[PDB]
Amino acid sequence: HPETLVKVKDAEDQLGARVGYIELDLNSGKILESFRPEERFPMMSTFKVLLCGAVLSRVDAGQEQLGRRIHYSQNDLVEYSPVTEKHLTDGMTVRELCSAAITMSDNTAANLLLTTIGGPKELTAFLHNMGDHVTRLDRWEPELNEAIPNDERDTTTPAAMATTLRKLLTGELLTLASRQQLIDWMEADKVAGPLLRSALPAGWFIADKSGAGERGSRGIIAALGPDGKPSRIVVIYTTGSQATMDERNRQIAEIGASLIKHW
Numbered sequence: 158h159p160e161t162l163v164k165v166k167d168a169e170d171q172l173g174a175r176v177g178y179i180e181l182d183l184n185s186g187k188i189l190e191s192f193r194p195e196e197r198f199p200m201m202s203t204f205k206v207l208l209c210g211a212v213l214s215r216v217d218a219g220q221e222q223l224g225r226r227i228h229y230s231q232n233d234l235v236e237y238s239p240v241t242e243k244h245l246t247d248g249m250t251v252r253e254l255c256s257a258a259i260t261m262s263d264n265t266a267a268n269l270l271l272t273t274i275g276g277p278k279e280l281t282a283f284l285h286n287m288g289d290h291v292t293r294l295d296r297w298e299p300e301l302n303e304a305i306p307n308d309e310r311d312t313t314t315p316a317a318m319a320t321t322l323r324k325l326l327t328g329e330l331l332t333l334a335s336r337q338q339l340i341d342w343m344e345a346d347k348v349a350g351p352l353l354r355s356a357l358p359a360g361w362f363i364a365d366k367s368g369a370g371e372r373g374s375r376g377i378i379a380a381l382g383p384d385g386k387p388s389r390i391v392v393i394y395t396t397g398s399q400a401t402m403d404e405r406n407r408q409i410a411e412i413g414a415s416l417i418k419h420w
């Protein structure tokens with residue numbers, strides 16, 4: 158709905174920065190609304206969903222086991238690792254690491270998982286192989302959140318990310334079991350409350366992943382829909398704002414309220 162673009166444009170005004178937006182029908186894959194669909198933005202933590210997608214793909218092929226335990230040490234701990242810093246002695250299973258990465262956005266968990274699949278190079282190869290030649294991961298946590306202006310490292314476009322998420326969630330790349338496992342991890346959340354979720358009515362379904370980086374970068378990817386069933390994919394990114402985190406959260410949530418209002 159054009160009224161939603163009014164809100165997206167208002168966000169650019171309020172934040173003094175670029176905002177990328179795309180809304181796709183989950184069933185058909187049809188593009189419903191878009192704003193700067195082909196401009197690059199830092200993915201930030203939203204890449205963690207693509208990461209676990211790749212992990213699940215290996216699980217499907219028998220190259221990995223969700224129950225396999227990964228041991229790590231203090232040397233591996235990077236900034237913001239709420240779950241992993243807690244299990245240094247126990248180690249964590251692949252399944253628990255994807256849960257930590259997606260529900261809490263644990264950064265060390267992402268690095269451990271990246272290692273299991275071959276690193277940023279292999280995640281990019283995975284995406285390229287499935288038809289996405291735009292999205293690219295180049296670095297590890299925490300550097301991949303740098304968001305240097307004009308830098309293409311660790312970026313995607315709203316359009317690239319939206320279609321790739323759609324392929325992972327409803328395409329035939331993953332088995333039904335894995336597709337649901339990925340959706341299940343995205344439905345759980347302890348950090349994206351201020352974003353789309355704050356505008357969502359209680360009965361709605363939402364599977365999402367948020368991201369935050371330097372230079373006011375903020376974003377979220379999600380599959381959502383009324384009455385417990387997702388029916389659309391929404392991707393929103395912004396970078397360059399000097400606004401506070403609460404201000405950025407509010408603008409993204411307002412885009413969500415408009416999306417919901419004109420559903």
Ligand SMILES: *[B]([O])([O])[C][N]C(=O)C1=C(O[C][C])[C]=[C]C2=C1[C]=[C][C]=[C]2
Pocket residue numbers: 201202203236237262264299302303367368369370371
């Ligand atoms: B992901 O983008 O959520 C990983 N994000 C960060 O590490 C990060 C956060 O979120 C968790 C603390 C907030 C602010 C930041 C971050 C990274 C770089 C600069 C600012």
Ligand SMILES: [K+]
Pocket residue numbers: 259260342343344345346347349364365366367
């Ligand atoms: K989530």
